[PDB]
């Protein structure tokens, strides 16, 4: 429960979990947008992927995820992670350190088809997009 392959958008001491990618959303202004991209390319996955949001998580990640929206402005298609990855045994976890919500999930085995998905962290008027890509390594 140490390494979380994800994005930590919070600021305080994340003592329990340590994330690979960090960008404190409180350090940017309303004219800024945080973009955090995670890529997973291995034959068999055993990775714990998650998120640390100090505001509101959209949608109900990671049970729900947004279909990635290139171009446009913000995503709008809600899909379910079990159908987007097409694997029938995924663990879902959640924890909260103060006002910071942490949403995780655990992948085991190989992924049939390379897919990607987006989760949104909105704090006040600022938004941070976490985009994950999981390769099939076919």
């Amino acid at each position: 429960k140490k390494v979380i392959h994800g994005c930590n958008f919070s600021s305080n001491v994340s003592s329990k979990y340590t994330f690979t990618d960090s960008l404190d959303i409180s350090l940017v202004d309303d004219s800024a947008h945080i973009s955090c991209n995670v890529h997973l390319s291995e034959p068999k996955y055993n990775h714990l992927v998650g998120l640390n949001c100090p505001g509101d998580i959209i949608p109900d990640c990671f049970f729900q995820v947004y279909q990635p929206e290139s171009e446009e402005l913000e995503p709008s298609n809600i899909v379910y992670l079990d159908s987007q990855i097409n694997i029938g045994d995924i663990e879902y976890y959640e924890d909260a350190e103060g006002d910071d919500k942490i949403k995780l999930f655990l992948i085991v085995g190989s992924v049939p088809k390379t897919t990607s998905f987006t989760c949104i962290c909105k704090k006040d008027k600022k938004s941070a997009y976490m985009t994950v890509t999981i390769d099939s390594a076919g």
Partner: antibody
Amino acid sequence: QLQLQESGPGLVKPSETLSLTCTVSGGSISRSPYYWGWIRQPPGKGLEWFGSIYNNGSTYYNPPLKSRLTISVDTSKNQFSLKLSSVTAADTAVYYCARHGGSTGMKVVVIAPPDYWGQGTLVTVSS
Amino acid sequence: DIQMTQSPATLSASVGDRVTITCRASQSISSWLAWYQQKPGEAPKLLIYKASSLQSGVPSRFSGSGSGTKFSLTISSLQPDDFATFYCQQYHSYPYTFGQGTKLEIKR
């Protein structure tokens, strides 16, 4: 309360090196997830982006200008500088420093337009 | 890299008229387009970010319209102090690129 201010000579002779320095007050460069860039505007012409630098020291340049361009940062004094070697009359412009974001192709990046600008200083390239 | 095509170059409109400035991107910049107002002798002032959102302290008469590559800036009723040169800029990717600008004169 963030304030940027350019400083440097406003008259440089041709084929020499133009130097400018931006001083940041009201905020710390080493704590900032933003990039620190330089934009110039020739008299009666449009705006041109030169390059930016992160508190790493990592620099990004407009490709057609990478050979003459050099941007450096000094986090212990909240300053970042610009070096333009082999100047010509085409380099006579008002030069601005500004805080802005990064590029899309990056892994973890702030996407933001230039919000805080300097006052701008005119540099005349002439003999 | 990404060419910003702004039009018109000049613009003359009386006080209280509706003024629209357009901007077109070479390729898709998503929604990362900004609008700047530059008075003479001053640095450009950021007016609009992410195509639609207004900077704080900006009068309500300014607005933006985002799309894939076509963008708009509109003033609902002009004021005397609105004369300036307006630039669009994409901050989608490096290198940053600007439009030719639009010099707005108020007709009287």
